[PDB]
Amino acid sequence: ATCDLASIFNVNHALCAAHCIARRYRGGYCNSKAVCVCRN
Numbered sequence: 084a085t086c087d088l089a090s091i092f093n094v095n096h097a098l099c100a101a102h103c104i105a106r107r108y109r110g111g112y113c114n115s116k117a118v119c120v121c122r123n
Contacts, residue, residue, distance in 0.1 A: 086113035095119045 086096045099119040100110030111121030 084112045087115060087117045089113060089117040 086093050089095055093113075095117075096111055096113045096119050099121040103121040103123040104110040106123060108122045111119045114120045
């Protein structure tokens with residue numbers, strides 16, 4: 084749910100989630116491939 088380390092851009096979950104969360108969604112989580120999976 085938090086992320087997956089990613090690298091020097093682990094924050095790639097909070098920024099993307101902003102759009103989703105705003106629409107009353109959960110937001111987004113980094114999958115195994117260290118990529119934000121924002122639920123929108």
